[PDB]
C-alpha cells in the first residue's frame, strides 16, 4: 500500500510565520487608529485625508489581486509537476508585483509633489509608515518569486521545489490580504 | 488503526484514544468559554463594590445585571459544550466497562 498523507512541514512553518507577521502589522494598525482617534477631535484628519486619490488606489488594488490570481494558477501548475506553467505564471506575477511597487512609488512621489510628507502632519507619518512597510513586504515578495525562479531554473523539479513554490504563494497571499485591510482602513473606513 | 485491542489485566493511559474527550474541539471551546465566564463574576463584584462606597451610582444596576447575564450564558455554554464533548467517552464506558 502507499504511504500515509502527513502534514507538509514547510507549509506549517510558513503559515506559522505569516500568523506571526499579522501581529507585526497589528502594531502599525494600532498606531494609525490612535492617530485617527486623536485627530477626529480637531477635525484636522478630515482635511489631511482629503489629499488622497482613491481611484488610483483602486487601480493598484486590482493589480495586486490580479497578482494573487496568477500566483495561484502557478501553484496549480506546480502541483501537477509542470515546470513551464509555473515559470509562466510566476513571471506574470513578478511583473504585476513590480507594477504595484511602481504604483505606490508614484503615489508617494505625487503626494510629496502636492504637500504631504512625513514632516507635514501626523497624518503624513501614519500614512507613510503604514503603506511603506507593506511596500517593503511587496518588494520582498517579488524577490522571493525571483529566487524561486532561480531554484527551478537550476535544479530538477522535484517535490522539494514544488513545495517551495507553494510556500512562497502563501506569503504573497498574505501580502494581498494585508493590502486589502490597509486599503479598507485608509481609503474607505477613513 | 481503526480499533484498539487490550488483553485482560492491561490498563493503558486513556488519553488521545479515539474515544477520548481531549481529541475533540467542543471540549476545548468549552474550556475557553468557561474561563471567559469568570469575567462576569468580576464585573458584578466590581459593580457592588463600587456601590459599597457610594460610587457608580448612575449605572451600577446595569453593570451588575449585565455581568450576571454574561456569566450565566458563558458558564452554561461552557458546561453544556464540555458535556457534549464528553458524550463519546460516556458511550465508550457503556460499551467496554473500562474507565481508562
Amino acid at each position: 500500500v502507499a504511504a500515509l498523507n502527513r502534514p507538509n512541514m514547510v507549509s506549517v512553518g510558513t503559515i506559522v510565520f505569516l500568523s506571526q507577521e499579522l501581529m507585526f502589522f497589528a502594531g502599525l494598525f494600532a498606531m494609525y487608529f490612535v492617530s485617527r482617534a486623536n485627530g477626529l477631535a480637531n477635525g484636522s484628519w478630515g482635511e489631511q485625508t482629503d489629499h488622497l486619490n482613491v481611484p488610483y488606489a483602486l487601480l493598484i488594488t486590482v493589480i495586486l489581486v490580479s497578482s494573487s490570481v496568477t500566483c495561484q494558477f502557478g501553484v496549480f501548475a506546480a502541483e501537477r509537476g509542470d515546470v513551464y506553467g509555473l515559470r509562466k505564471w510566476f513571471l506574470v506575477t513578478i511583473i504585476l508585483g513590480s507594477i504595484f511597487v511602481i504604483g505606490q512609488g508614484y503615489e508617494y512621489i505625487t503626494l510629496v509633489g502636492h504637500g504631504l510628507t512625513i514632516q507635514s502632519s501626523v497624518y503624513g507619518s501614519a500614512f507613510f509608515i503604514t503603506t511603506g512597510f507593506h511596500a517593503l513586504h511587496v518588494i520582498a515578495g517579488v524577490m522571493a518569486f525571483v529566487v524561486v525562479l532561480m531554484r527551478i531554473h537550476k535544479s530538477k523539479f522535484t517535490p522539494a521545489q514544488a513545495t517551495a513554490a507553494m510556500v512562497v504563494s502563501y506569503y504573497w497571499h498574505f501580502v494581498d490580504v494585508v493590502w486589502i485591510g490597509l486599503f479598507i482602513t485608509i481609503y474607505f473606513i477613513q | 488503526p481503526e480499533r484498539m485491542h487490550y488483553i485482560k489485566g492491561y490498563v493503558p493511559v486513556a488519553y488521545s484514544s479515539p474515544h477520548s474527550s481531549l481529541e475533540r474541539s467542543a471540549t476545548w471551546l468549552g474550556m475557553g468559554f468557561l474561563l471567559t465566564a469568570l469575567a462576569g463574576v468580576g464585573a458584578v463584584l466590581f459593580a457592588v463594590g463600587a456601590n459599597s462606597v457610594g460610587q457608580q451610582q448612575e449605572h451600577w444596576v446595569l453593570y451588575s445585571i449585565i455581568g450576571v447575564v454574561f456569566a450565566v450564558v458563558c458558564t452554561v455554554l461552557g458546561t453544556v459544550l464540555i458535556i457534549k464533548g464528553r458524550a463519546p467517552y460516556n458511550r465508550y464506558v457503556k460499551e467496554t466497562g473500562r474507565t481508562q
Binding site: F17, S19, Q20 | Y6, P12, S16, F46, Q100
Partner: protein, 574 residues
C-alpha cells in the same frame, strides 16, 4: 503487542565518547557551520551565561555606587546607563536565549525526533541573537555612552528631542535583532512538535517541559513582532521627522500600552519553561510521577491564555487605564501558578526524596518564587500599587520572581542535564557551595529592599541624602550583593573542571529514575539522538523501560480509589 526473536550475537551500539577529549580544531569550523540542535543549544547556553556575567557586573557597580550617599565614582549619566543596560541585557540577552537554548537541546530528545524542523533557521536564530547582543553593547564605545532611559524606554523621553546620541538608537536595533532571533527559534519548536513526534508518543504523553515550550512558542510569536513594529516606529520617529509618539498625539500612553502588551508576555515566556524544568526535576528525585499531569497542562494553557489580557496592570498610576478590569484579570492569572505550586508539593507528598544538587536548586526556586509571587499579588491591587508602584518594593518583587524562576531554575537545569549534555557529572560539593552562597547572598540583598521601597526610596535613584533615613538598609543590601557576585566563582570553576576532567557517566540515567524520554538514550546522545527508541506508552518512557516490574503498580495506584477496570474483559483481537 509484538515480541521479536532474538538476534545472533547481538552487541549494544558504541555509545559516543565524553566531552573533553576533543582534538585541536575539532569545534571551530563545526561551530561555524553547525546545524545540529544539541551542539547549537550548548553554545546558546554558554553565550547566554556570558551575557549574564556581563550584566551582573553592571548590577554590582550600581550597588557599589548606592553603598553610601554622595556620588563616589559614578555620575548621574553613568548610573542611568548602567541600570538601563543591566536590565536590557539580563532580560533579553540572558533570559530568552537561555530559554531557547534549553528548548533546542532538550525538546527533540523528549519528543523523540532526530533534529529540529528547520536546522538552518535555528542557526540563524543563534547568530542573529549574538549580533543583536553585540549591537546593543556597542553603545558603550560611544563617547556619550549607551542608552539611558530604563529598559522600558518610555516616551517622550525616547524622542529625538529628549534622547539624542546614537546609543539610544543602538538599543533599538540590538533589541530588534534579538527579537527576531527569538522568533526564528519559536518557528521551529511549534513545527517540530506538530510534525516530528516519535511513534506512539501522542500529544498527552509528552513531558511537561515541552508542553510549556509549546505554549511559550505561540505566546512569543504573538508578542515579539509587536515589539519589532513599535521599535521600528520609534526609530522612524527618531531618524525621520515622525510624530506618531509625540505627546500631543498621545504618544506617551500609546507607547506604554504597546510596550507592556509586548512585555508582560515576555515575563511569562521566561516563567513557564523553567516551571517545566522543575516539573521534570521534582518527579525524578522524589521517585514519584508528576501529580495532576493533564491538570498541569490545563494550568499552563490557562497561563498562556491569561497573559494576553493582563498587560495593563503595569500602568495603574498613569491615570489612563481602567483599574477594575485589569486588576481582576491580574488576580485571575495567580490561580494557575498556585495550581502548579500545589502540584509540585503534591508530587513531593510522601515521596522518597534524595537531595542531589538539582533537587536542592528546585526546592530553593520554589521557596524564592513563593514569596516573589506573594509580593506580586500585593502589587496587583491598585490601591496598594498607588504607593508601591515604581519603588524598590517593585525592584525586590521582580528580582524575586526573575532570580527565582530564571537563575535558580536555570542552574537546576544545568546540573540536571550536564550528564546528558556532556557525558560527565558535575562536582557535588562545589554545587552545594554555589547554592548556599547564591541563596544567602540573594536573600540578604533583596529581602531588605522591600523596606526601603516602603519607606519611600524610588527606583532608579542615583544619589540620596544622608537625612532621608535609608542609608543603613542600602549598606546591608550592598554587602550581600557583593556576596551574590562572589557566588558565581564556584559555578564557573565547577563547569570548567567538570567539562574537562569530570566523573564519566556510564549508565543512560545517572540520577536513576529519569521519567522523560531523553534519559533512555546515551550520555551524550549520538549525532541523531537515538540508537533505539523504547516502547513509548505513558508520560514515563524511560522509567517504565528501566523498571518493568513497577509497571503493574504504576498503572494501578495512579488514581485514588481506582476503579475495577483492570478486570474488564478483552476488547478486541489482533
Amino acid at each position: 503487542t509484538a515480541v521479536a526473536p532474538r538476534v545472533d550475537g547481538h552487541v549494544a551500539p558504541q555509545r559516543p565518547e565524553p566531552t573533553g577529549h576533543a582534538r585541536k580544531g575539532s569545534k571551530a569550523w563545526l561551530m561555524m557551520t553547525t546545524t545540529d540542535h544539541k551542539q547549537l543549544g550548548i553554545m546558546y547556553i554558554i553565550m547566554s551565561f556570558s551575557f549574564f556575567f556581563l550584566g551582573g557586573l553592571m548590577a554590582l557597580l550600581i550597588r557599589a555606587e548606592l553603598f553610601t550617599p554622595g556620588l563616589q565614582f559614578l555620575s548621574n549619566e553613568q548610573f542611568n546607563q548602567l541600570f538601563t543596560m543591566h536590565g536590557t541585557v539580563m532580560l533579553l540577552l540572558y533570559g530568552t536565549p537561555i530559554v531557547w537554548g534549553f528548548a533546542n537541546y532538550v525538546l527533540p530528545l523528549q519528543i523523540g525526533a532526530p533534529d529540529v524542523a528547520f536546522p538552518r533557521l535555528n542557526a540563524f536564530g543563534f547568530w542573529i541573537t549574538t549580533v543583536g547582543g553585540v549591537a546593543m553593547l556597542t553603545g558603550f564605545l560611544t563617547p556619550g555612552g549607551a542608552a539611558d532611559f530604563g529598559w522600558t524606554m518610555y516616551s517622550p523621553l525616547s524622542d529625538a528631542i529628549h534622547s539624542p546620541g546614537l546609543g539610544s538608537d543602538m538599543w533599538i536595533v540590538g533589541v530588534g535583532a534579538t527579537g527576531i532571533g527569538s522568533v526564528a527559534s519559536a518557528i521551529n519548536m511549534l513545527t517540530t512538535i506538530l510534525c516530528l513526534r516519535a511513534p506512539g508518543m501522542t500529544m498527552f504523553r509528552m513531558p511537561i517541559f515541552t508542553w510549556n515550550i509549546f505554549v511559550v512558542s505561540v505566546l512569543a510569536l504573538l508578542i515579539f513582532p509587536l515589539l519589532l513594529a513599535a521599535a521600528l516606529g520609534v526609530l522612524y520617529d527618531r531618524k525621520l521627522g515622525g510624530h506618531l509618539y509625540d505627546p500631543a498625539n498621545g504618544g506617551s500612553l500609546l507607547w506604554q500600552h504597546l510596550f507592556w502588551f509586548f512585555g508582560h508576555p515576555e515575563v511569562y515566556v521566561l516563567a513557564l519553561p523553567f516551571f517545566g524544568i522543575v516539573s521534570e526535576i521534582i518527579p525524578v528525585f522524589s521517585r514519584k510521577p508528576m501529580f495532576g499531569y493533564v491538570g498541569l497542562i490545563f494550568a499552563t494553557l490557562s497561563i498562556g491564555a491569561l497573559s494576553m489580557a493582563v498587560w495593563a496592570h503595569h500602568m495603574f498610576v498613569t491615570g489612563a487605564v481602567l483599574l477594575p478590569f485589569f486588576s481582576f484579570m491580574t488576580f485571575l492569572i495567580s490561580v494557575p501558578t498556585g495550581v502548579k505550586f500545589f502540584n509540585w508539593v503534591g508530587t513531593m507528598w510522601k515521596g522518597h526524596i534524595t537531595w542531589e544538587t538539582p533537587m536542592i536548586w528546585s526546592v530553593g526556586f520554589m521557596a524564592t518564587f513563593l514569596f516573589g509571587g506573594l509580593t506580586g499579588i500585593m502589587l496587583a491591587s491598585p490601591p496598594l500599587d498607588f504607593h508601591l508602584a515604581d519603588s524598590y518594593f517593585l525592584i525586590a518583587h521582580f528580582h524575586y520572581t526573575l532570580f527565582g524562576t530564571v537563575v535558580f531554575a536555570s542552574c537546576a537545569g544545568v546540573y540536571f542535564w550536564f550528564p546528558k549534555m556532556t557525558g560527565r557529572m558535575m562536582d557535588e560539593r562545589l554545587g552545594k557551595i554555589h547554592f548556599w552562597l547564591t541563596f544567602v547572598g540573594f536573600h540578604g540583598t533583596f529581602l531588605i529592599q522591600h523596606w526601603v521601597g516602603n519607606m519611600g526610596m524610588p527606583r532608579r535613584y542615583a544619589d540620596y541624602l544622608d537625612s532621608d533615613g535609608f542609608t543603613i538598609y542600602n549598606q546591608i543590601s550592598t554587602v550581600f550583593s557583593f556576596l551574590l557576585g562572589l557566588s558565581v566563582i564556584p559555578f564557573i570553576w565547577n563547569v570548567f573542571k567538570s567539562w574537562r576532567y569530570g566523573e564519566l557517566v556510564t549508565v543512560d540515567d545517572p540520577w536513576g529514575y529519569g521519567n522523560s524520554l531523553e534519559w533512555a538514550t546515551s550520555c551524550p546522545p549520538p549525532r541523531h539522538n537515538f540508537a533505539s527508541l523504547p516502547r513509548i506508552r505513558s508520560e514515563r518512557p524511560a522509567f517504565e523501560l528501566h523498571y518493568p516490574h513497577m509497571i503493574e503498580r504504576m498503572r494501578a495506584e495512579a488514581h485514588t480509589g481506582h476503579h475495577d477496570d483492570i478486570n474488564a474483559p478483552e476488547l478486541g483481537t489482533a
